Specification:
Helix content is 51%, strand content 5%. The protein is mainly alpha-helical and 81 residues long. The protein has one domain: Multidrug-efflux Transporter Regulator, Chain: A, Domain 2, CATH 1.10.1660.10. Strands 1-2 form a two-stranded antiparallel sheet. Keywords: DNA-binding, Transcription, Transcription regulation. This is B12 binding domain/transcriptional regulator, MerR family.
Length: 81
Amino acid sequence: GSHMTLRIRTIARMTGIREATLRAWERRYGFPRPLRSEGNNYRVYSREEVEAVRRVARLIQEEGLSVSEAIAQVKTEPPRE
């Protein structure tokens, strides 16, 4: 009982071009935050990270500042279903 967790490989798959930004963020801020599980070369992630990330990534196609902006935004405005 709980949602399917996937890897940055899946999050990147959305357009590929994000992977340069996803791997950057790993050292640039830590978003999406790797869930505390198995995987060394690969990290695990939920749909709640993907929701924000998939937004941030498309937001980056509008200006790119959304790297720091939409991260700092989702840090101050966390998700709630």
